């Protein structure tokens, strides 16, 4: 079903990186794998991703570069599942890297944070069977 080195969960196939990429670079990589950065729409999917990434900052397909927060596959953000860390997203400018924070990642407890897109975090690709 899922290709070698991909993991099946609830009619999706997932690929967990072991290296880091800036968010756009990770987004590109998933696209070229016939996939997309993971889009998380339920607790069940959130917990599955958590189990596989462990306590590691990991990009997901959620960003506010178009204006509103958007999932990379068009799934509606406002009516959808959200698991932000408390007082995230905050578009923090204090990181010194320039600009705000426009890309969501899983944090080491699974809850989400907006961070600077250039950080080389791990990422998860997802493709739907």
């Amino acid at each position, epitope marked *: 079903g899922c*290709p070698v*080195n991909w993991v099946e969960h609830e009619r999706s196939c997932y690929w967990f990186s072991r290296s880091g990429k800036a968010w756009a670079d990770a987004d590109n990589y998933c696209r*070229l794998e016939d996939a997309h950065l993971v889009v998380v729409t339920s607790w069940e999917e959130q917990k599955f991703v958590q189990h596989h990434i462990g306590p590691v900052n990991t990009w997901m397909g959620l960003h506010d570069q178009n204006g509103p927060w958007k999932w990379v596959d068009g799934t509606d953000y406002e009516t959808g599942f959200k698991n932000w860390r408390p007082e995230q997203p905050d578009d923090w400018y204090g990181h010194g890297l320039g600009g705000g924070e426009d890309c969501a990642h899983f944090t080491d407890d699974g809850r989400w944070n907006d961070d600077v897109c250039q950080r080389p975090y791990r990422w998860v690709c997802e493709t739907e069977l």
Partner: antibody
Amino acid sequence: EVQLVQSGAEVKKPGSSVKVSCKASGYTFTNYGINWVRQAPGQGLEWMGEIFPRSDNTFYAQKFQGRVTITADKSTSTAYMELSSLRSEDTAVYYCARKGRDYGTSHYFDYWGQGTTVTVSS
Amino acid sequence: DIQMTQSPSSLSASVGDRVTITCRISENIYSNLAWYQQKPGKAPKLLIYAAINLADGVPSRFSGSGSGTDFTLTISSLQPEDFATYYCQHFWGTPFTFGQGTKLEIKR
């Protein structure tokens, strides 16, 4: 050993269609995209499109959209590129290429077919 | 389509020379860039991928450098079999586009 083997040269009248095949061997066909790249005589390389055989998802360069069709037959590990409404400027060598990957870094065209010469002429 | 500006378009060099070919990109593609060699009548052959990685079996005299929008292919010591046309290609989104090619010919 990975090999991509293409069908033979084709002479086509303007307005006709050509279908070029690309038989893949030596790897899991559904694990990599098959890409089509053409080269007009004396010119550079031009990407036409890609198919992912697992999903049959295709991507075409806009200038060929509505004119190129890429298909894949998982049962024979063969991909096809069909270019319709042929014109003189479609005279070219057509290559298929596997889009390989190093995990977590980048993609690349590592294995190429031998090329298929398509001459569009009346 | 992303614009790929390869320079020079033609280069004359001697066996043993260092050769450098540059590829400028119209936007940031990180390291998603490959270099190919093509000889007349042959399919292109992958030399460098992910901007700086030497492809399997390719001699180490080939090296790539750069990221973002400026990339370089270097042949540290030109060999007689290296006279060919070279292309860069991005792997950023769609459509993939190639540089216009650099033809390396023999100086005399």
